[PDB]
Symmetry: C2
Subunit: 363 residues, 2 copies
């Protein structure tokens, strides 16, 4: 049925690496000393979980992860609080999303509580990698791949679940948010109804690289994902999309696309919606937003802020959109950004223990 | 923007050779030969020299982008031992073309197509006793290209691995008759979308299909009929192209297949079948949209002769039944010969095994 944290076999590294300067860190480039691995087969089920030194995987070249993208991942973070206790943030939501992704991948199910405990054991061993800074954190990358050594397209009879750790630094520079410009070309689609875009399966990402390179060489930084005949705004890069504006009815509104199958249900997205409801200061709407809705609002000076949301950076303000040849300015930064900054402050307060709330777990 | 070169091949022969399988008990994709081709790439130094070496595990940094973001693609083609004992490839330059276009779309580094093909030929030549001694088995060739970027950002890879595996494959049919397949047709799943990568052989197009295939077998079916759009266009069958031999709505006999409008993989077998059928000039050949409604209208109508899938492994695969909206719909493929399917199978097979010449084959 499942591996068990009580069976953990731990092989410590005998040489330890020096830690990076948290302020000089690129996301996903530096790894800690150890990793978690757990093997599965249909014949014997789950093997015992191992923590061992970071090393290459040994994979049969026919492994289905390499041929048919039988893989999924997660992302969550460990935070060194102002009281020096290490916290995780809503990790159970990630365990939930990962399990669902595994079912949809036909990867073997596991006990979410045991995985969580194994990750905590790994973070505990490598806890010195959790930076001494309230603008840096330790990124946790659970990954799950088919290692079926046969070329049939089929449910894997072998798999590997592993966890990597990677320190992540601040996304601010010169004291402020560093806004992004987006490339909006409806020729590309990220996800479609009946597809797998609401799951964190590897398959959804390989096809985005071409569009990202096109964004870059037009001097944008990220892609604005459009969908349907009406050019709905869905996501920004690998982040969920929020729009703070005066809506059609002249009402102040925080809007985000609904979970209708083509939106990844981000943890950050869920938390922001919970905050905004609790505050009760403006309307909170999961609703469709089109490029027309947006360009109209802009002409009528009704847009206050646009930002992405995701684990790594929390929130990411948008300053410009390149669409049908014209550079459209978004006034996010000229408006503070008031709401983006409030959300970043509130989320980080919770993550670093400045505010105690049950969204976090110590250890 | 360079290439590895066949001239530079470094060959490390296996000291211990494995016993070949019985041609008549082969399961696709299960048994591998003694050697493999590997070629390393980096943005810093470009392509390394190609290696032929013993089949062995890959050693990948766990951050490799193939494992996280499906930065990967593959191909599939075959080698055949002819009636004259010469080993042939079939239309391989088409596989090289498709592989190249797949690499571009995946943002993996380009290479020279002729150089890859040549390296594949040297691999096969080394492992040539693995090309089955059988008139209905062949050697399946699996070129694979993966991103091995050791970093978690979603980006164009700065490291990659190109490799090739060889795998004997046997007949799909025995004692002179096809084994037809039944299809599960549920419009809730969508294989591919306009503006997506369904017309490339990128790994990410396949991961999403396991769940539907499992749902198919849990319903007694063997394969998925992939439907698209509000009018339920029939597109592909499993990982095969879809052909329909019928009397069309104008009362003409027609071979029909969905057009290459972005959601269809351009199969080599598909191309060959269309080429043959255009050349025969005995019925109308139409790249055209086909819907579940067209299909069921034609059946209650007795206008359908045959439906079949096409693909490199089995060549052609007759369809006997479709499960759609609770209903089992019989397709009369097997009660109509299946003449056209048998003809295509004989014709392509004759070409592949050298019983007939057409400049569609290359001798090793
Ligand atoms: Mg989309
Ligand atoms: Mg996704
Ligand atoms: Mg969103």
């Amino acid at each position: 049925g499942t591996f068990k944290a009580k069976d953990l076999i731990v092989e410590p590294a005998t040489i330890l690496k020096e830690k990076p300067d948290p302020n000089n860190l690129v996301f996903g480039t530096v790894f800690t000393d150890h990793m978690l691995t757990v093997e599965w087969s249909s014949e014997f089920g789950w093997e015992k979980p191992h923590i061992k030194p970071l090393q290459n995987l040994s994979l049969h070249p026919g492994s289905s992860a390499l041929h048919y993208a039988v893989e999924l991942f997660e992302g969550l973070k460990a935070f060194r609080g102002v009281d020096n206790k290490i916290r995780l943030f809503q990790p159970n939501l990630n365990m939930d999303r990962m399990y669902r992704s595994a079912v949809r991948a036909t990867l073997p199910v596991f006990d979410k509580e045991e995985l969580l405990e194994c990750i905590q054991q790994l973070v505990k061993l490598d806890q010195e990698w959790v930076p001494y800074s309230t603008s840096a954190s330790l990124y946790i990358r659970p990954t799950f791949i088919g290692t079926e050594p046969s070329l049939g397209v089929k449910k894997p009879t072998k798999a590997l679940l592993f966890v990597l750790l990677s320190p992540v630094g601040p996304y601010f520079s010169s004291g402020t948010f560093n806004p992004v410009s987006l490339w909006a070309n409806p020729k590309y689609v990220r996800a479609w109804k009946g597809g797998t875009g609401d799951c964190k399966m590897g398959g959804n990402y390989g096809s985005s690289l071409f569009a990202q390179c096109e964004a870059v060489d037009n001097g944008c930084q990220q892609v604005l994902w459009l969908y349907g005949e009406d050019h709905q705004i869905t996501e920004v890069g690998t982040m969920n999309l929020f729009l703070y504006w005066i809506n059609e009815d002249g009402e102040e509104e925080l809007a985000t696309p609904p979970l209708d199958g083509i939106i990844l249900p981000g943890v950050t997205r869920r938390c922001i919606l919970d905050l905004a409801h609790q505050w009760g200061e403006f309307k909170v709407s999961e609703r469709y937003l089109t490029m027309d809705d947006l360009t109209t609002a802009l002409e009528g000076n009704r847009v206050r802020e646009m930002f992405g949301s995701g684990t790594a950076c929390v929130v990411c303000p948008v300053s410009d959109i390149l669409y049908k040849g014209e550079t459209i300015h978004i006034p996010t930064m000229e408006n503070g950004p008031k709401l983006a900054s409030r959300i970043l402050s509130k989320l980080t307060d919770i993550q670093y223990g400045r505010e105690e709330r049950d969204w976090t777990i110590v250890l």
